Amino acid sequence: DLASLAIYSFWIFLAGLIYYLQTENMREGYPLENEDGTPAANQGPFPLPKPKTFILPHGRGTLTVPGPESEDRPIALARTAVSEGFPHAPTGDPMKDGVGPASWVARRDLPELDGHGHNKIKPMKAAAGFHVSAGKNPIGLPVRGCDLEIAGKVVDIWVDIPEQMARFLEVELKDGSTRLLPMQMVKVQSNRVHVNALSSDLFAGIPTIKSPTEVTLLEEDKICGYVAGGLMYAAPKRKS
Amino acid sequence: AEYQNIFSQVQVRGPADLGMTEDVNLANRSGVGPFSTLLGWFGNAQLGPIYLGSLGVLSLFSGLMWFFTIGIWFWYQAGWNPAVFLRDLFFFSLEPPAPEYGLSFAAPLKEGGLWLIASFFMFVAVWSWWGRTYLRAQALGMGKHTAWAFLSAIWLWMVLGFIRPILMGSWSEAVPYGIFSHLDWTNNFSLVHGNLFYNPFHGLSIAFLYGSALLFAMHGATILAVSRFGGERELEQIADRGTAAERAALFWRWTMGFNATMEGIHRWAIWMAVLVTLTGGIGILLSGTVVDNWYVWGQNHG
Amino acid sequence: ALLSFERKYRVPGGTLVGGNLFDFWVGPFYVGFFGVATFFFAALGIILIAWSAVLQGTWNPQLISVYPPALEYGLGGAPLAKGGLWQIITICATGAFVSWALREVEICRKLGIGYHIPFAFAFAILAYLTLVLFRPVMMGAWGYAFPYGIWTHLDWVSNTGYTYGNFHYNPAHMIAISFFFTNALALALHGALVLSAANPEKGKEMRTPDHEDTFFRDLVGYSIGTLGIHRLGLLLSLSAVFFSALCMIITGTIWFDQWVDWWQWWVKLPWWANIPGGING
Ligand code: BCL
Ligand code: BCL
Ligand code: BCL
Ligand code: BCL
Ligand SMILES: CC[C@H]1c2cc3[nH]c4c(c3C)C(=O)[C@H](C(=O)OC)c4c3nc(cc4[nH]c(cc(n2)[C@@H]1C)c(C(C)=O)c4C)[C@@H](C)[C@@H]3CCC(=O)OC/C=C(\C)CCC[C@H](C)CCC[C@H](C)CCCC(C)C
Ligand SMILES: CC[C@H]1c2cc3[nH]c4c(c3C)C(=O)[C@H](C(=O)OC)c4c3nc(cc4[nH]c(cc(n2)[C@@H]1C)c(C(C)=O)c4C)[C@@H](C)[C@@H]3CCC(=O)OC/C=C(\C)CCC[C@H](C)CCC[C@H](C)CCCC(C)C
Ligand SMILES: COC(C)(C)C/C=C/C(C)=C/C=C/C(C)=C/C=C/C(C)=C\C=C\C=C(C)\C=C\C=C(/C)CC/C=C(\C)CCC=C(C)C
Ligand SMILES: CCCCCCCCCCCC[N+](C)(C)[O-]
Ligand SMILES: CCCCCCCCCCCC[N+](C)(C)[O-]
Ligand SMILES: CCCCCCCCCCCC[N+](C)(C)[O-]
Ligand SMILES: CCCCCCCCCCCC[N+](C)(C)[O-]
Ligand SMILES: [Fe+3]
Numbered sequence: 063d064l065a066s067l068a069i070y071s072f073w074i075f076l077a078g079l080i081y082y083l084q085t086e087n088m089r090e091g092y093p094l095e096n097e098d099g100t101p102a103a104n105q106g107p108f109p110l111p112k113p114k115t116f117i118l119p120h121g122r123g124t125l126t127v128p129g130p131e132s133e134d135r136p137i138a139l140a141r142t143a144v145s146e147g148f149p150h151a152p153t154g155d156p157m158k159d160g161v162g163p164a165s166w167v168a169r170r171d172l173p174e175l176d177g178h179g180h181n182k183i184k185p186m187k188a189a190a191g192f193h194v195s196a197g198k199n200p201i202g203l204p205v206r207g208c209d210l211e212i213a214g215k216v217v218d219i220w221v222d223i224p225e226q227m228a229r230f231l232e233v234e235l236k237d238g239s240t241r242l243l244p245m246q247m248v249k250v251q252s253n254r255v256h257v258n259a260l261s262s263d264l265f266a267g268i269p270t271i272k273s274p275t276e277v278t279l280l281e282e283d284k285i286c287g288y289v290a291g292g293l294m295y296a297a298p299k300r301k302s
Numbered sequence: 303a304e305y306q307n308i309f310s311q312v313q314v315r316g317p318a319d320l321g322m323t324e325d326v327n328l329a330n331r332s333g334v335g336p337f338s339t340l341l342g343w344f345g346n347a348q349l350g351p352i353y354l355g356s357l358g359v360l361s362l363f364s365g366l367m368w369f370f371t372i373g374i375w376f377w378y379q380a381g382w383n384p385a386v387f388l389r390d391l392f393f394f395s396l397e398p399p400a401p402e403y404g405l406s407f408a409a410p411l412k413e414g415g416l417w418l419i420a421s422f423f424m425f426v427a428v429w430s431w432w433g434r435t436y437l438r439a440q441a442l443g444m445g446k447h448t449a450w451a452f453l454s455a456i457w458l459w460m461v462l463g464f465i466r467p468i469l470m471g472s473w474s475e476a477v478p479y480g481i482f483s484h485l486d487w488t489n490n491f492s493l494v495h496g497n498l499f500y501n502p503f504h505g506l507s508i509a510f511l512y513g514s515a516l517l518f519a520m521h522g523a524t525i526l527a528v529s530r531f532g533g534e535r536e537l538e539q540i541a542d543r544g545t546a547a548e549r550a551a552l553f554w555r556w557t558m559g560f561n562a563t564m565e566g567i568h569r570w571a572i573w574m575a576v577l578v579t580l581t582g583g584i585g586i587l588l589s590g591t592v593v594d595n596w597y598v599w600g601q602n603h604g
Numbered sequence: 605a606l607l608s609f610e611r612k613y614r615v616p617g618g619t620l621v622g623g624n625l626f627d628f629w630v631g632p633f634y635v636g637f638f639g640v641a642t643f644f645f646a647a648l649g650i651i652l653i654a655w656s657a658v659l660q661g662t663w664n665p666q667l668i669s670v671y672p673p674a675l676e677y678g679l680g681g682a683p684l685a686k687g688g689l690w691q692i693i694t695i696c697a698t699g700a701f702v703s704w705a706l707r708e709v710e711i712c713r714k715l716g717i718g719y720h721i722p723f724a725f726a727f728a729i730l731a732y733l734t735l736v737l738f739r740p741v742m743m744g745a746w747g748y749a750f751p752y753g754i755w756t757h758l759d760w761v762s763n764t765g766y767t768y769g770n771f772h773y774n775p776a777h778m779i780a781i782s783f784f785f786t787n788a789l790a791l792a793l794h795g796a797l798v799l800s801a802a803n804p805e806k807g808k809e810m811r812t813p814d815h816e817d818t819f820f821r822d823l824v825g826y827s828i829g830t831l832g833i834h835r836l837g838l839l840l841s842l843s844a845v846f847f848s849a850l851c852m853i854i855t856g857t858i859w860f861d862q863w864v865d866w867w868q869w870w871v872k873l874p875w876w877a878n879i880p881g882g883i884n885g
Contacts, residue, residue, distance in 0.1 A: 389871050514787060558633075
């Protein structure tokens with residue numbers, strides 16, 4: 063009867079849908095590879111999907127996936143075994159090197175633009191009409207690191223204009239140079255801003271941006287990458 | 303105590319955003335509203351503006367027409383007595399025309415006609431809002447996903463109060479407007495058709511509902527887990543995969559063996575949820591029009 | 605074996621327990637110490653479940669079902685065929701679940717991300733623990749637990765439900781359902797919102813977050829926006845499940861009567877209890 067027809071129908075629908083769904087989720091990082099970068103032998107039952115192209119919005123070009131993958135950057139990792147499936151030890155400073163939990167992908171070196179063509183993200187000094195509206199204003203707080211030592215001072219907040227939201231703190235180092243510090247990895251406090259991933263001695267190592275009114279997608283990644291990795295790599299300096 | 307980003311810890315404000323101006327008849331958009339700092343702890347503080355306009359207007363109008371045609375009925379029950387009105391608020395009920403009348407539009411106003419008026423108002427309210435959901439996408443040159451997704455919902459509602467009543471031969475087979483009464487109807491609808499736990503669409507529908515919570519839990523916690531690399535900026539990450547997309551995919555590949563892309567995870571999403579009411583609507587539609595009793599059907603499936 | 609960008613992530617470290625011992629992969633899968641724990645618990649339990657399938661004398665999965673010790677055994681242990689097997693199986697499930705969470709922690713660390721996912725999962729684990737552990741215990745017998753079988757478990761649901769009347773009236777059950785519905789609504793929207801921006805009208809240029817935000821204000825005149833909707837989803841989910849636990853942990857323990865009747869409190873407030881009219885006079 064209809065019921066049995068409908069339900070058998072549906073289990074069939076659902077199966078091609080998962081299949082659809084799954085191949086659609088194969089537009090990045092495929093096909094698979096061996097630890098050497100050779101194409102692996104077995105890609106599973108699902109084919110690569112027939113490719114699609116994204117028209118990007120401010121003359122910034124085109125994107126077609128699936129397409130050619132390459133980590134367009136050296137990887138400083140030595141194998142630690144004779145067989146697939148083991149960790150690959152860093153051969154240098156995984157921080158300085160950008161491997162591990164400190165990894166970054168070589169994104170574009172343009173900035174994200176709002177819908178109007180202007181840079182999504184700005185230092186608030188150049189962000190016309192913008193002001194801290196609730197919550198402790200960090201600007202002016204000293205910055206502590208996980209070693210319980212001071213590392214700098216906040217000398218502005220880099221705001222996302224269209225979503226109107228603090229994304230980074232800019233910090234002034236002893237140096238007199240500044241770094242960005244992702245909003246999501248600091249505790250703004252009553253009198254200090256505490257940074258747990260980095261001990262004071264590693265802040266200088268936080269990567270720098272070329273323009274000082276501007277970050278690019280590449281520099282966001284290198285930075286967020288850097289300070290995320292400290293969680294693992296600074297942890298010896300990370301005093302309780 | 304690492305920071306979690308469930309709550310913004312410093313809020314920031316700027317000139318009211320009046321939004322992109324694609325083909326939006328800008329005449330129709332309202333003025334910016336105030337800013338809730340309350341809301342601002344969680345997400346955006348900008349209340350408003352809103353594009354109202356004929357379809358917005360008609361919808362919004364009848365939306366109240368429906369709401370009010372019910373509420374007075376409640377009052378008429380309460381003996382116009384605001385104590386009673388408050389005491390008995392969930393117990394009141396606007397029920398459909400007695401099955402005597404069936405699909406008749408001639409039921410006395412006091413014996414079911416007040417229900418039809420209310421429904422007629424809801425029908426127009428809901429469809430016009432649907433069309434509103436579409437036009438808004440068109441005027442910004444966006445895909446029409448929100449409208450499709452909205453149909454799924456509309457499907458089950460269509461089926462509950464409209465198609466199934468018609469297919470059964472009477473309006474009495476619909477859902478009464480009332481807080482406690484639509485609960486009862488529901489518990490009873492199951493009892494009559496031999497326990498919906500044996501309707502395999504019902505069971506399918508539960509699996510998706512459970513799964514929508516499953517997934518939105520997975521997706522949400524993941525984006526927050528990688529917002530330290532700007533995960534929430536999903537459009538640009540689609541356009542240019544960041545480490546955020548990569549640690550996201552990777553955490554999941556290493557846990558359970560396969561994974562999504564940033565555009566991908568949102569397809570899992572819209573379908574995982576849209577299937578709740580899509581399956582749902584069916585389970586109900588066959589119920590009583592074609593299967594009198596799901597146990598008996600469960601026995602020999604024909 | 606590896607995704608095209610995987611290898612620089614496959615570094616050593618992040619393990620909670622046992623150093624480099626189990627710090628390695630198998631296919632895509634990461635094996636913790638806890639990779640091993642969960643395997644062992646999962647093996648054992650699936651074994652005991654088959655052993656039940658034998659004492660029961662089916663292999664058909666629609667029939668297999670593994671009930672708790674009956675109410676006489678209380679919170680003691682039953683003979684295997686008489687409820688012991690379920691009790692172990694329950695111990696093993698717990699072992700599996702917790703372990704699976706800890707491994708998510710260990711992956712989190714290696715990748716350098718937050719712990720929000722292990723976090724949210726512990727609410728599911730908690731919902732399960734409520735029905736098979738906290739409630740049974742507070743009630744006083746393993747026998748109040750649901751049974752491990754595909755339909756028999758729907759049956760527990762239904763009778764347990766119908767024990768207290770129409771279970772709709774359980775007020776925390778009302779709260780918990782509103783989130784389930786609300787969450788699905790929000791997952792519907794979020795998904796649709798992104799896809800429609802990433803996949804615009806045609807030869808039209810991939811829209812923007814600003815477009816996304818704009819679409820909503822036009823529509824309903826406010827937009828939680830993109831950090832928000834992900835914070836929203838995590839919350840509605842966790843809340844649905846949180847209230848689901850609630851509504852059960854109170855049922856049978858501090859309320860054992862018909863749920864509809866608990867509503868009498870409202871209606872019997874003394875400043876209207878005695879008025880004549882409406883539904884209740
Ligand atoms: C799904 C299958 C059944 C059914 C089964 C159930 C069951 C069972 C339950 C509900 C519940 C709800 N149902 Mg129902 N319900 C159905 C179809 C509907 C339809 C419809 C098709 O048009 C509507 C409007 C509702 C509406 C409602 C709400 C009253 C309530 C929570 C809504 C929600 O979570 O939305 C999610 C998101 C939204 C944004 C809409 C929210 C709407 C708000 C305003 C409702 C809050 C009520 C409040 C204002 C009452 C007064 C409070 C003070 C004490 C004065 N149901 C069909 C007939 N419904 C739950 C409930 O608690 O009811 C009492 C519940 O337990
Ligand atoms: C929490 C609420 C109630 C309850 C009420 C209901 C109701 C009501 C229904 C179900 C339904 C289902 N329930 Mg139940 N269920 C409960 C607790 C459980 C437990 C519990 C141990 O934690 C589990 C594992 C299940 C599992 C299941 C599935 C068999 C089925 C589809 C669920 C789904 O899509 O979820 C979403 C999750 C996913 C999509 C992820 C993948 C899940 C897969 C499907 C898990 C299957 C596991 C199963 C085959 C056993 C494997 C165990 C051993 C390793 C072999 N329920 C409690 C008692 N359950 C529906 C059904 O149709 O089954 C009869 C249904 O109508
Ligand atoms: C005693 C009760 C019976 C039973 C009888 C029913 C009945 C009857 C029905 C369900 C339905 C459902 N049941 Mg059942 N069900 C039982 C036990 C369960 C259990 C459980 C045991 O734990 C669970 C988890 C469920 C879960 C569910 C859902 C999966 C499903 C509805 C999905 C939905 O989101 O609709 C919510 C969404 C909507 C109603 C869509 C409406 C959208 C419209 C357009 C909203 C417009 C709003 C309006 C214009 C006003 C504006 C709003 C205000 C501004 C606020 N059932 C038992 C066996 N169940 C439905 C189903 O699909 O079954 C197959 C259904 O009809
Ligand atoms: C006749 C039935 C009664 C009734 C009786 C009950 C009873 C009794 C219960 C509920 C519960 C619930 N009801 Mg009710 N309910 C009714 C009608 C409804 C309808 C209806 C449509 O109106 C709705 C929407 C609901 C909705 C709901 C939810 C609030 C809740 C179930 C989800 C949950 O708890 O997640 C919790 C999630 C879990 C337990 C999942 C845990 C999963 C674990 C951690 C891991 C699984 C791993 C698995 C083994 C993996 C397999 C391996 C493979 C590799 C996959 N009820 C009617 C009136 N309802 C249940 C509840 O609240 O529980 C606390 C419950 O016990
Ligand atoms: C896949 C199905 C799931 C889902 C999805 C879903 N719902 C949707 C959509 C989607 C994808 C839409 O895009 C659409 C939407 O508009 O999103 C915001 C919608 C929608 N889902 C809604 C509700 C809803 N969805 C439900 C369920 C579900 N929706 C599932 C979870 C339910 C349940 C659980 O039963 C409810 C309660 C609406 C918010 C919205 C459609 C709104 C609508 O159609 O109403 C028309 C207008 C009126 C009725 C106006 C009157 C409203 C009140 C009765 C009067 C008081 C309020 C008034 C506005 C005050 C005005 C004061 C004046 C002085 C100005
Ligand atoms: C906030 C709670 C919501 C949610 C979230 C959620 N679930 C999660 C996560 C999160 C955050 C994970 O990261 C984790 C995951 O890895 O997902 C892919 C998971 C997970 N949630 C799962 C299921 C699940 N979650 C559910 C619900 C929910 N999970 C909520 C909607 C349900 C419901 C709706 O019932 C189910 C069925 C798994 C897919 C996965 C956890 C997998 C796992 O724990 O592995 C360890 C165990 C095994 C491999 C096998 C179990 C071995 C046992 C010893 C044998 C079986 C015993 C059992 C008692 C049988 C009972 C069967 C009968 C009831 C039919
Ligand atoms: C506070 O004081 C005031 C004045 C504000 C009054 C208060 C008002 C109140 C308290 C109102 C309360 C309303 C409530 C609680 C409504 C609840 C509804 C619920 C619980 C569920 C609704 C389910 C109903 C559905 C499924 C109905 C579906 C309807 C249809 C699909 C349309 C039916 C079609 C019709 C009759 C055909 C008309 C003609 C055409 C165009 C074909
Ligand atoms: C229009 C739908 C909006 C739903 C979002 C509401 C979430 C509010 C959460 C609390 C916000 C503020 N806080 C932190 C002070 O609690
Ligand atoms: C979005 C893809 C995930 C869909 C989940 C499919 C598994 C659900 C199994 C439900 C068991 C159902 N049935 C029909 C016997 O009742
Ligand atoms: C429902 C769970 C599906 C998980 C899919 C996992 C894909 C694994 C690919 C084969 C890897 C093989 N192995 C373990 C033999 O090395
Ligand atoms: C944190 C572990 C929780 C596992 C829950 C297992 C429930 C059954 C355990 C009781 C077994 C026997 N008893 C009553 C003699 O103790
Ligand atoms: Fe998302």
